[PDB]
Design a binder for this molecule. Structure first.
Ligand SMILES: CCn1cnc(C(=O)NCc2ccc(F)cc2)c1
Length: 149
């Protein structure tokens, strides 16, 4: 697949992250992000995807080195970490045909792994509406420790 870029936006306490919920195949919650255009810089793709999905402009806050990148089934997803955005900020998508909802979620209440089905003697993972966000939660928790303490 083609690389995706986006943001992990945090509030002022650093307790909460901003997630978006899509429709149909993208019906769960995740960080706002999307596919790079041809010849587009990562930081510009991130700013654009976040603006389209949330109405918030991260251009003046992105730090070029502050991101978490994961290759997930051979698809790179890089999310720039944007701390300190006020929780009263009013978010409104441009592409409202693709975004159902936009909400803050507590980091400490988000899972950092999905639960198994071992009490059912069944292999695999139970469905989780935070599936897309989950792989970033531990690395974010470790980046926040290392940056802020
Ligand atoms: C099981 C696969 N799946 C479920 N939900 C997603 C998902 O990415 N939701 C968040 C989102 C981000 C951006 C966007 F434009 C629309 C939705 C992926």
């Amino acid at each position: 697949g083609v690389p995706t870029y986006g943001a992990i936006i945090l509030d002022e306490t650093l307790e909460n992250v901003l997630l978006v919920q899509g429709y149909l195949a993208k019906s769960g919650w995740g960080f706002p992000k999307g596919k790079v255009n041809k010849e587009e810089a990562p930081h510009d793709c991130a700013a654009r995807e976040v603006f389209e999905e949330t109405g918030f402009d991260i251009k003046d806050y992105i730090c070029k080195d502050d991101y978490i990148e994961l290759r997930i089934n051979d698809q790179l997803a890089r999310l720039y970490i944007i701390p300190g955005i006020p929780k009263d900020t009013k978010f409104n998508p441009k592409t409202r045909r693709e975004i159902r909802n936009i909400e803050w979620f507590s980091i400490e209440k988000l899972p950092c792994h999905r639960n198994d089905m071992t009490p059912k003697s069944k292999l695999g993972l139970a469905p989780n509406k935070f599936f897309m966000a989950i792989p970033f939660i531990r690395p974010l928790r470790d980046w926040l420790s290392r940056r802020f303490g």
